[PDB]
Design a protein around this ligand. Structure first.
Ligand SMILES: COC1(Cc2ccccc2)CCN(c2ccc(C(=O)NS(=O)(=O)c3ccc(NC(C)(C)CSc4ccccc4)c([N+](=O)[O-])c3)cc2)CC1
Length: 138
């Protein structure tokens, strides 16, 4: 069984716990190893994109809508997906850090919707999660 919401709400544990939070997922072992290596490799490219959203006047929701639009602009792929989850986590880290913990619930909700209303067709088409783990699995 695979749940986009169960993973989206639990996958935000390693991104927050590192600073101070709760929760935990079981399949994170995959997205994690793939995410950690990403942040390190594309640390600058990622940070540069993060600052951009901070410069814009948009709100918490707006930013997420702008970061998701640019990410999946020239198509989709396991790679872009690994980055999408990365941004989501960071977005929460800033909230809790900027006295906006409650926002964490919002960001977690959005990531769940988009995943179940945008990347639900592509994923299933690319062997779904089954393939995601088969490629870059523990
Ligand atoms: C600034 O634009 C970004 C940042 C960003 C912008 C906006 C919103 C969110 C994020 C988002 C766009 N972006 C990239 C950079 C590269 C690729 C990439 O290499 N894709 S891939 O399809 O070639 C690939 C390679 C290797 C792995 N996994 C390994 C084998 C475990 C290595 S760790 C790794 C993870 C992912 C990418 C590279 C290495 C995985 N994966 O796990 O999905 C995927 C994809 C997007 C630049 C940073």
């Amino acid at each position: 069984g695979y749940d986009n919401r169960e993973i989206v709400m639990k996958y935000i544990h390693y991104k927050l716990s590192q600073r101070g939070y709760e929760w935990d997922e079981v399949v994170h072992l995959t997205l994690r190893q793939a995410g950690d290596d990403f942040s390190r490799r594309y640390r600058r490219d990622f940070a540069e994109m993060s600052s951009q959203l901070h410069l814009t006047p948009f709100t918490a929701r707006g930013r997420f809508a702008t970061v998701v639009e640019e990410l999946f602009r020239d198509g989709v792929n396991w790679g872009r997906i690994v980055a999408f989850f990365e941004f989501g986590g960071v977005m929460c880290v800033e909230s809790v850090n900027r006295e906006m913990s409650p926002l964490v619930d919002n960001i977690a909700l959005w990531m769940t919707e988009y995943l179940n209303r945008h990347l639900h067709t592509w994923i299933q088409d690319n062997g779904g999660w089954d393939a995601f783990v088969e490629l870059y699995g523990p």
